[PDB]
Amino acid sequence: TRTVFVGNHPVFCDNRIVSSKYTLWNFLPKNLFEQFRRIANFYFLIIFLVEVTVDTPTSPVTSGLPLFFVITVTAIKQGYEDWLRHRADNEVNKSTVYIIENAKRVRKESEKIKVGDVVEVQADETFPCDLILLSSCTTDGTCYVTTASLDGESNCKTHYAVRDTIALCTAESIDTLRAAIECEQPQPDLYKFVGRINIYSAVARSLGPENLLLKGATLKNTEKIYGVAVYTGMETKMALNYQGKSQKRSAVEKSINAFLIVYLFILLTKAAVCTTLKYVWQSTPYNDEPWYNQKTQKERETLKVLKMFTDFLSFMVLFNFIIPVSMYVTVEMQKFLGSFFISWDKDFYDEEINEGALVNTSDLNEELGQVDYVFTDKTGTLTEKLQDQAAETIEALHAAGLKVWVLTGDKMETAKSTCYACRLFQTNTELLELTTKTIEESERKEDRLHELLIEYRKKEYGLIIDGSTLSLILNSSQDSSSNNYKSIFLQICMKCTAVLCCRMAPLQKAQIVRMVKNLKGSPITLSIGDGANDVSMILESHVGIGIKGKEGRQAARNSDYSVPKFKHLKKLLLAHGHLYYVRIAHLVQYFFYKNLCFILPQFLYQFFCGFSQQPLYDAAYLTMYNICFTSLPILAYSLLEQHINIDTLTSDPRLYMKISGNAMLQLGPFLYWTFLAAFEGTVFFFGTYFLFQTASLEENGKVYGNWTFGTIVFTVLVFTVTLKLALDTRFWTWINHFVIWGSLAFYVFFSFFWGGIIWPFLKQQRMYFVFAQMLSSVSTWLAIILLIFISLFPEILLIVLKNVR
Amino acid sequence: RPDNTAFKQQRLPAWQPILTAGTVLPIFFIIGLIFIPIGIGIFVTSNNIREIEIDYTGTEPSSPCNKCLSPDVTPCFCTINFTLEKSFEGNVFMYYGLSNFYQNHRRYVKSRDDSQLNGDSSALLNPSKECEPYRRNEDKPIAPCGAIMNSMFNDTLELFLIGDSYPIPIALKKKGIAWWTDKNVKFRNPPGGDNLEERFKGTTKPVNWLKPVYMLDSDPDNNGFINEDFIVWMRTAALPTFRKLYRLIERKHPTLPAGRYWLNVTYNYPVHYFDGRKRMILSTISWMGGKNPFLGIAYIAVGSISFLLGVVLLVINHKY
Numbered sequence A: 001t002r003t004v005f006v007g008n009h010p011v012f013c014d015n016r017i018v019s020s021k022y023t024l025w026n027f028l029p030k031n032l033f034e035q036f037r038r039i040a041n042f043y044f045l046i047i048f049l050v051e052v053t054v055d056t057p058t059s060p061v062t063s064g065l066p067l068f069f070v071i072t073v074t075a076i077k078q079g080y081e082d083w084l085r086h087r088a089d090n091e092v093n094k095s096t097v098y099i100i101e102n103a104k105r106v107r108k109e110s111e112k113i114k115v116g117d118v119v120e121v122q123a124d125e126t127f128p129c130d131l132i133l134l135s136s137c138t139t140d141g142t143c144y145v146t147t148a149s150l151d152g153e154s155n156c157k158t159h160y161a162v163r164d165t166i167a168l169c170t171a172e173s174i175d176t177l178r179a180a181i182e183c184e185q186p187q188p189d190l191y192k193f194v195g196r197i198n199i200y201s202a203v204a205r206s207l208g209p210e211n212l213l214l215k216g217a218t219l220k221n222t223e224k225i226y227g228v229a230v231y232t233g234m235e236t237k238m239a240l241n242y243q244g245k246s247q248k249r250s251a252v253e254k255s256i257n258a259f260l261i262v263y264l265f266i267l268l269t270k271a272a273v274c275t276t277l278k279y280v281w282q283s284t285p286y287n288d289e290p291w292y293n294q295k296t297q298k299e300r301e302t303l304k305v306l307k308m309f310t311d312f313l314s315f316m317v318l319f320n321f322i323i324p325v326s327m328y329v330t331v332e333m334q335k336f337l338g339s340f341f342i343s344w345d346k347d348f349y350d351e352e353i354n355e356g357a358l359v360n361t362s363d364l365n366e367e368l369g370q371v372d373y374v375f376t377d378k379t380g381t382l383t384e385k386l387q388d389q390a391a392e393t394i395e396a397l398h399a400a401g402l403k404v405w406v407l408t409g410d411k412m413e414t415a416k417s418t419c420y421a422c423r424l425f426q427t428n429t430e431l432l433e434l435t436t437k438t439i440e441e442s443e444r445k446e447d448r449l450h451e452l453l454i455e456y457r458k459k460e461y462g463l464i465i466d467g468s469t470l471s472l473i474l475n476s477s478q479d480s481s482s483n484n485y486k487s488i489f490l491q492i493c494m495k496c497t498a499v500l501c502c503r504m505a506p507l508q509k510a511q512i513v514r515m516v517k518n519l520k521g522s523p524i525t526l527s528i529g530d531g532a533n534d535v536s537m538i539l540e541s542h543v544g545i546g547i548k549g550k551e552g553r554q555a556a557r558n559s560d561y562s563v564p565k566f567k568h569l570k571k572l573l574l575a576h577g578h579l580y581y582v583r584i585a586h587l588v589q590y591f592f593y594k595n596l597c598f599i600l601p602q603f604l605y606q607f608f609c610g611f612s613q614q615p616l617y618d619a620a621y622l623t624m625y626n627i628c629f630t631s632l633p634i635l636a637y638s639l640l641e642q643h644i645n646i647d648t649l650t651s652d653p654r655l656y657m658k659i660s661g662n663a664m665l666q667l668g669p670f671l672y673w674t675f676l677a678a679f680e681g682t683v684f685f686f687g688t689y690f691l692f693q694t695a696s697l698e699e700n701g702k703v704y705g706n707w708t709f710g711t712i713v714f715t716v717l718v719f720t721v722t723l724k725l726a727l728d729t730r731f732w733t734w735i736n737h738f739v740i741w742g743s744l745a746f747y748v749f750f751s752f753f754w755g756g757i758i759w760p761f762l763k764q765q766r767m768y769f770v771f772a773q774m775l776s777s778v779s780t781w782l783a784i785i786l787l788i789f790i791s792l793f794p795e796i797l798l799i800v801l802k803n804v805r
Numbered sequence B: 001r002p003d004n005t006a007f008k009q010q011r012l013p014a015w016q017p018i019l020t021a022g023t024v025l026p027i028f029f030i031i032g033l034i035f036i037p038i039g040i041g042i043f044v045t046s047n048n049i050r051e052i053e054i055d056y057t058g059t060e061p062s063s064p065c066n067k068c069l070s071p072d073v074t075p076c077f078c079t080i081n082f083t084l085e086k087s088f089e090g091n092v093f094m095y096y097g098l099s100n101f102y103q104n105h106r107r108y109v110k111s112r113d114d115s116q117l118n119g120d121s122s123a124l125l126n127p128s129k130e131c132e133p134y135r136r137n138e139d140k141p142i143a144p145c146g147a148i149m150n151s152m153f154n155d156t157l158e159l160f161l162i163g164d165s166y167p168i169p170i171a172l173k174k175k176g177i178a179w180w181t182d183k184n185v186k187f188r189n190p191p192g193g194d195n196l197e198e199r200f201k202g203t204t205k206p207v208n209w210l211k212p213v214y215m216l217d218s219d220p221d222n223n224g225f226i227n228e229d230f231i232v233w234m235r236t237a238a239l240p241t242f243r244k245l246y247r248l249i250e251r252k253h254p255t256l257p258a259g260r261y262w263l264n265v266t267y268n269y270p271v272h273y274f275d276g277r278k279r280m281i282l283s284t285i286s287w288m289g290g291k292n293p294f295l296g297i298a299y300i301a302v303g304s305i306s307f308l309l310g311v312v313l314l315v316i317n318h319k320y
C-alpha cells in the first residue's frame, strides 16, 4: 500500500516521538479542566463560591484555601511527571543520526529523518527508525541485531540485506540505483512484515521480516549498514507497541468518591428538609416577626422565590462540614509522607547496585495491599539461572491468594523450563498448550478452545499461549457473539493454576492485563519487569513495578515503585501494602464519621429554633474542629499504626487475604461507621437537651444559654471522637500518646484561653466565660461523663463480643 | 546506606495493648457499681427539691389575669392565689418562664453590639448594623441597641404571705442573679465622671423602653448596662421554653412557710400575640442545681444495662 522511494529520487510523518501529554502553553487550562471535572473538586469550588457570595458561618478562607492547596499540589505533581516525560522525549529525539543525502554523509538529529532516506547506522548503535536493510558492507549481506528493547532477550538475531543491493557501500548507494519499496501500513506485530522492492536500472524482490531493522534494536558485530527509512516515529513498531499512561486511581480513591456522593445526597436531603420545614413553620404569621425579632424593610421586600433559594444555600453551607475538605489535605500529606517508609527500608537495599527502593508516585501506596493478579517478566526479573528467592517469592504470593502469570518475549522452550524451575509448573501439572505447534492455523483454535473449556477444565492445569495465537484470539474476537474467543480463553485462564505467555510483544503484554482488568469484579493487577519491553504492561496495570537491573532504567522510570530484586516484592506487598491500605481505609472512615458526628447535633438544633440557620457551636469552634482539635491524632494513626506487626505480616502471607477486595471500605463497614456517627450525634444533642430541662444547673441558681448548650455538645463530641480513635489504636508510640492526649489537653486550654479575655479584635464576646462557667457545675461534669460513655458503649460492646467466639 | 533508625525502619517501641473479653469484661461491673450509687444519689437529691410553677398568662377566661390580655389602662394588676403545701427551707430562687419565645433565632441572637455593652466610647454613638431593626431611632443611636434588648421582660412580680388575712411582703433581692464575670467585665458602663445620664448623651432609649437605660434602677452599681435584670435577659436562651433568674429569697422558721400566698403581678409583657405563656417559678437548689430527674434516671439505667450485660456475658464465657 505505502510506496517508498529509496533515495527519495524519482523513478508520511517524521520520527518525532511524543510520550508527553501537556504542552507548556496549554498545561494550566488542560489540568484545571481535568481537575475540576471531578465531582469532589467541583463541589468544593461551588461551596467556596457560595460562602463568598451568599452566606457563611465561618470565614470563606477555610473553605477555599485547602482547595487551592490540593489543586496546586496535584497540578505540580502531574506537571513534573509530564516534564520528566518531555525530557526523555528530547533525548530520544535530538540524537545524532547520519543520513546520506547527496553522495555525502550528512549529520542530522533523530527526529529529522524522513520516510525514504538512507541511514548509516554503525556498530553498537541503536536504529533510529524501521529500516529496510539495503547493504551491510561485508560481502555476505548479513548483520547481527539484539532486540532487547522489544523482547527483552539479549541474543543475536541475524538479518539479511537485499541481494541486488548488498554491494553498495562507500556512500555510493546513491549510484542512480534507485528503487521503490511498496510495503504495508504499519502494524504493531514485530514478526510479520510484507512488502516488495522494485530496483530500477526492473527486478522485484519480495521483502520480509528478515530485512526490516526495527527501531530500538542495536546493531551488533557489524561495522556499518545502510538502510531505507520505511516507517518513522509514531508509526514504528516500537511506537505502536507503546500505548500510553492513563490516570491511575487506587481502590481507596474510588471508594472515597462513592462515600462523597452518598454524603452529598445526605447533605442535600438535610438542606431540603430544613428549607421545607422552615417555610412550613413560617406560614404562621406570628412564627416569623413575633414583635420581638422583626425584619428590616429589605428582608420583607426580598423576593419570595429568591429567599427560598438563599435559605437552601445557607443550610447547605451550615451543614457542609459532613463532606470534609480537610480529608483531602490530610490524604495528600499522608500519601507524601508514607512513601518515605518505602524509600528508607533497609530490606530493599542491594549491595551489588548500591541502591534501595524508589518511589515514583505516592498516590498508589494503598493499591499495594489490594493486588489480585501479578504479571511477571521472565528474563532479568525471574532469572539472572534463577534469581535469589524467585521460587520462595512465588510460593509466598500464592499463599497470599494471588495469581502469578508470566508474560515474556522469550521463546516457549526456555520460558517453560523457567516456569518449571520456579515451581510455577509442578510435575503433576497438565499443560494445555495453545502455541503454534498444536494450532494448525484455520479454525482449529475454535476446536481447541471448546475442547479445553467445555469438556476438559470445567470439570493441575497450566495454560501455555503463544504470541501468534493470542493475536488470532484477540484480533478475531470482534466477529462472533455466540461463543466469544476472548471469553472462552479467559475462562480457561482463570481456571488454570498458572498461565505462560511466550513470544509476546510489548503491546500484547498490556493487552493481557487489560483483559484481566475487565473481568466480572475488578481485580487489581500488578506488573513487574526490568526492561523497556515491559513498559507498556507496567503503564497499563493498577500498580507497575520496575526493577533496577542490567537492561537500563526505562522500566524503573515508567513505573510507580522500583525495587532492585524480584524477591523484594514479598515485603513490598505483604507488609508495606497491607499497612498502607489499613491506615488510609481507617482514615477515610474516621474522617467521615467524625464530621457526621460534628454536624448531626447542629442539624437537630434547627427543629428547636425556627429553622433559622442558627449554628449550634461558636465560629471559633466550627473553624478549628478539623484544624486543631481532631486533625493530628488521625494523621499520626495513618503514619505509625501497625494493627499487625511488620515481622508478623512478612512471616504469614495468609493475612493478606483479610483485606482483599477493599474489605474495609464495603457497604457493611461503611454502614457501621455511618450509623455509629448518627447514634453518637443524636446522643450528644438529646442528652444535653434533657439536661437543660431544669431551672438551673448550678448551686447558685444561675441559668445557662444557647452558647453553653453548644459548648457542652462540642466538649462531649470532641472527647467521644478522640476516645474512639484511642480505642481503635493498637500501636501506641510516644508520638501517638503525644498527639492523642495533647489534642484533648489543647482543646481544654484553648477553651480557657480564647474564652476568658475580652478580645479587642472581635465584634462579639459570646464565648467570654462560657467554658469556665460550664465547668463550675458538678451536674455538667456528670452529664458529660455519662454522655461520653453512652456514646462509646456500642463500641465497647463490639470489642467485647467479636473478641470471643 | 539507608539510615537504620527506629523511626525510619518502622520499629519504634510501642505499648501494643490487648483488650479482649478477659480484660474488658470486668469493667461492665466496675461501671455498674459506680453509676447506680451515683444515679440513686442524684435522683434522691432531685426529689428533695421543692418547686412550684404558676402560670399567669391569663388566656382562659376563668383567670385573675384575663383582664390584662387586652386592657384599657396599660399598667393593670392581677393577683393569683396559690398555696405552698410544704415549706421551702433553704435558699429560694424565683424564676420567670417563657415558652414559644425563640431567643435562639438566628436573627434575634446577633441583634446586639457586644463592644457597645462593654462600655466602648466609639460604639456607644456608632452601634453595629447587626442590631439594625433597632439601631437608630429619631435620628439618634439607641443606647441598648438590638432586638434582644428591645424585647426585655418587664413584668413586676411580688410575693405576699397571707397571715388573719393580712398580707406580709417577702423580701426579694435583685443583686447576685447574673454571672459575676459578665456583670463585672463583659458588661461595663461608658466612661464618664459621676453622672450616668450625661454618659448617654447622644444616644436614645429603645423604642419599647418607657425609661432610659440610666434610669433602670436607682442603685448606681445596678443602673445601666450593668443592671443584673438587663444582663440576665441579654443572655439568650437555648430552647424556646426557658427560665430566667428574677430574684433571690435569702435564707433567714422556713424561708417560705407553708400557707396561703399572693402573687401580685404588674402585667406589662405581651406574650399572647404569639402562642406564648408566662410562668413564675419558686425553687430551692442543691449541689446539682434545680430539679431534674433525667441525670439520675439515666445514670441508674446506664449502670443497670452495664451490670446485666456483664453478668450475662461472664456466664456466657464460663461455658469453656
Ligand SMILES: CCCCCCCCCCCCCCCCCC(=O)OC[C@H](COP(=O)(O)OC[C@H](N)C(=O)O)OC(=O)CCCCCCCCCCCCCCCCC
Binding pocket: A058, A061, A062, A063, A065, A066, A069, A073, A076, A077, A320, A321, A324, A325, A326, A327, A329, A330, A332, A333, A334, A336, A337, A622, A623, A625, A626, A627, A628, A629, A631, A632, A635, A738, A739, A742, A743, A746
Ligand atoms: C508534592 C507535595 C506533596 C504534598 C505535601 C504534603 C505535606 C503538607 C505540607 C503542609 C501543607 C499545609 C496544608 C494547607 C491547607 C490549609 C487548610 C486549612 O487550614 O484550611 C482549613 C481546612 C479545611 O477545614 P474543614 O474543617 O474541613 O472545614 C472547611 C469547611 N469548608 C468550612 O466551612 O469550615 O482544614 C484542613 O484541611 C486542615 C487539616 C490539615 C491537618 C494537618 C495540620 C494540622 C495543624 C496543626 C495542629 C494544630 C495544633 C493543635 C493541636 C496540638 C496538640 C497536639
Ligand SMILES: *[C@@H]1O[C@H](CO)[C@@H](O[C@@H]2O[C@H](CO)[C@@H](O[C@H]3O[C@H](CO)[C@@H](O)[C@H](O)[C@@H]3O)[C@H](O)[C@H]2NC(C)=O)[C@H](O)[C@H]1NC(C)=O
Binding pocket: A291, B150, B151, B152, B154, B207, B208, B209, B210, B211, B268, B269, B270
Ligand atoms: C413592657 O414591654 C412591652 C413589650 O416590649 C411594651 O409594649 C410596647 O410598648 C411600646 C411603647 O409604647 C410600643 O411601641 C409603640 O406603641 C404605639 C403603638 O401601640 C406607638 O404609637 C408608639 O409610638 C410606640 O412606638 C409597642 O408597640 C409595645 N409592644 C407591644 C407588643 O405591646 C410595654 O410598653 C412595656 N411596659 C413598660 C416598659 O412599662
Ligand SMILES: *[C@@H]1O[C@H](CO)[C@@H](O)[C@H](O)[C@H]1NC(C)=O
Binding pocket: B077, B078, B079, B262, B264
Ligand atoms: C395585691 O393584690 C391584692 C388582690 O388580691 C390586693 O388586695 C392588694 O392590695 C395588692 N397589693 C399590692 C401591694 O398591690
Ligand code: ALF
Binding pocket: A151, A152, A153, A377, A378, A379, A380, A381, A407, A408, A409, A410, A529, A530, A531, A533, A534
Ligand atoms: F523475560 Al522478558 F521480557 F521476557 F525481560
